[PDB]
Enzyme design. Structure first.
Site, short mmCIF file in Angstrom:
data_model
loop_
_atom_site.label_atom_id
_atom_site.label_comp_id
_atom_site.label_asym_id
_atom_site.label_seq_id
_atom_site.Cartn_x
_atom_site.Cartn_y
_atom_site.Cartn_z
N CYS A 177 -2.24 0.79 -13.49
CA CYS A 177 -2.28 0.79 -12.03
C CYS A 177 -3.47 1.70 -11.69
O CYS A 177 -4.51 1.60 -12.35
CB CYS A 177 -0.93 1.18 -11.45
SG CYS A 177 -0.10 2.63 -12.19
N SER A 178 -3.35 2.61 -10.72
CA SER A 178 -4.46 3.54 -10.52
C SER A 178 -4.39 4.73 -11.49
O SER A 178 -5.32 4.93 -12.27
CB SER A 178 -4.52 4.02 -9.05
OG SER A 178 -5.78 4.68 -8.83
N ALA A 179 -3.27 5.45 -11.52
CA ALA A 179 -3.11 6.56 -12.48
C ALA A 179 -2.47 6.16 -13.81
O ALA A 179 -2.57 6.91 -14.79
CB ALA A 179 -2.28 7.70 -11.86
N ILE A 188 0.87 5.64 -14.33
CA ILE A 188 2.18 6.28 -14.54
C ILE A 188 3.28 5.78 -13.60
O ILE A 188 4.46 5.78 -13.98
CB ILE A 188 2.09 7.82 -14.47
CG1 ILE A 188 1.62 8.31 -13.09
CG2 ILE A 188 1.18 8.38 -15.58
CD1 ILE A 188 1.57 9.87 -12.95
N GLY A 189 2.94 5.34 -12.38
CA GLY A 189 3.94 4.96 -11.40
C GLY A 189 4.41 3.52 -11.47
O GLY A 189 5.43 3.23 -12.12
N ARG A 190 3.68 2.60 -10.84
CA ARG A 190 3.97 1.17 -11.04
C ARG A 190 3.98 0.78 -12.51
O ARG A 190 4.82 -0.04 -12.93
CB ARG A 190 2.97 0.29 -10.26
CG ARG A 190 2.82 0.68 -8.81
CD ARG A 190 1.67 -0.06 -8.16
NE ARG A 190 1.48 0.47 -6.83
CZ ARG A 190 0.48 0.12 -6.04
NH1 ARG A 190 -0.35 -0.85 -6.39
NH2 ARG A 190 0.31 0.76 -4.88
N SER A 191 3.06 1.34 -13.30
CA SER A 191 2.99 1.03 -14.74
C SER A 191 4.28 1.45 -15.44
O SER A 191 4.76 0.74 -16.34
CB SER A 191 1.79 1.71 -15.40
OG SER A 191 0.52 1.18 -15.01
N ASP A 207 0.83 -1.21 0.00
CA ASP A 207 0.00 0.00 0.00
C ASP A 207 0.86 1.26 0.00
O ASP A 207 0.54 2.24 -0.68
CB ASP A 207 -0.92 0.01 1.24
CG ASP A 207 -2.33 -0.54 0.97
OD1 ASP A 207 -2.59 -1.22 -0.05
OD2 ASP A 207 -3.21 -0.32 1.85
N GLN A 224 6.87 7.91 -10.28
CA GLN A 224 6.21 8.96 -9.48
C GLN A 224 7.02 9.43 -8.28
O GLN A 224 6.69 10.50 -7.71
CB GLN A 224 4.86 8.44 -8.97
CG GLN A 224 3.76 8.60 -9.96
CD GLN A 224 2.41 8.17 -9.41
OE1 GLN A 224 2.15 6.97 -9.26
NE2 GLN A 224 1.57 9.14 -9.08
#
Length: 284
Positions: free
Chosen positions: A215-217, A219-222, A181, A262
């Site tokens: 992912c959620s946005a 940009i980060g994990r993706s 998380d 991110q």
């Protein structure tokens, strides 16, 4: 410079925040005018994460062709990816329309539906074989065929049917379920194992449309997923693998979607993943 030495250098001097801010300063800025039109407000999850006009995926409809999704085309590595936000209640039909129209074989999901007690994306696939989903706005049917639950990820086989033509296609859903998380994973071993499972399936290969990753946005994990994959492929392809410059690859990818990676922690984790993954590419 061998990234492994660059890594220790940054780690001992504790300058990850400085490196990351340099990337933010040099990153491309291109217009995103379509994303900001008033008619598209409920198609965006986050006000500050938008696809550039020049690289956005267009839906094949005359009504409104907009989805928050970008085509990342890596020319030397000969890999393409579609990076997108987690679907919203009003865009689950658009999401599967894109998968259909772009001829994708795989979807890569790097978040859980709920994280930190809040919803991070819609429940956009069916959880039971006998309870299929119909998306009336885009005329598609989606059925769960099989599910394989492992300790760090789940792989699902799905059937997508274009109800207009009755063509069907098999889509593979690769769901990494254990990103924490807060922060990033302590070891890249399970993330790399996951990447290799996606590769082994054919979903990243040129006989199919680009993989859809989110992912959620988006940009980060993706960004971590596609950055690690492309850097490892370049180390395979070149005469001198130590010539691969992860910061330069990241800036190339940011020509196609804003904000990839991110945090400074995500940047360090990406280095760690490539360094450890190379100890399979190079032959060990």
């Amino acid at each position: 410079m061998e990234m492994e030495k660059e890594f220790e250098q940054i780690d001992k001097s504790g300058s990850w925040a400085a490196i990351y801010q340099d990337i933010r300063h040099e990153a491309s800025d291109f217009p995103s005018r379509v994303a900001k039109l008033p008619k598209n407000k409920n198609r965006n999850r986050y006000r500050d994460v938008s696809p550039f006009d020049h690289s956005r995926i267009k839906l094949h409809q005359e009504d409104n062709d907009y989805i928050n999704a970008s085509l990342i085309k890596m020319e030397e590595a000969q890999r393409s990816y579609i990076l997108t936000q987690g679907p919203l209640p009003n865009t689950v039909g658009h999401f599967w329309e894109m998968v259909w129209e772009q001829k994708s074989r795989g979807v890569v999901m790097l978040n859980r539906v709920m994280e930190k007690g809040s919803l991070k994306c819609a429940q956009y696939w069916p959880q039971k074989e006998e309870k299929e989903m119909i998306f009336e706005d885009t005329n598609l049917k989606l059925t769960l065929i099989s599910e394989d639950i492992k300790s760090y990820y789940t792989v699902r086989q799905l059937e997508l049917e274009n109800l207009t033509t009755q063509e069907t296609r098999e889509i593979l859903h690769f769901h990494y379920t254990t990103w924490p998380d807060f922060g990033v994973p302590e070891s890249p071993a399970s993330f790399l194992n996951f990447l290799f499972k996606v590769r082994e399936s054919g979903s990243l290969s040129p006989e199919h449309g680009p993989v859809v990753v989110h992912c959620s946005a988006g940009i980060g994990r993706s960004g971590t997923f596609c950055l690690a994959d492309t850097c490892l492929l370049l180390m395979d392809k070149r005469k001198d693998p130590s010539s691969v410059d992860i910061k330069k690859v990241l800036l190339e990818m940011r020509k196609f979607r804003m904000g990839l990676i991110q945090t400074a922690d995500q940047l360090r984790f990406s280095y760690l993943a490539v360094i450890e993954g190379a100890k399979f590419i190079m032959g060990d």
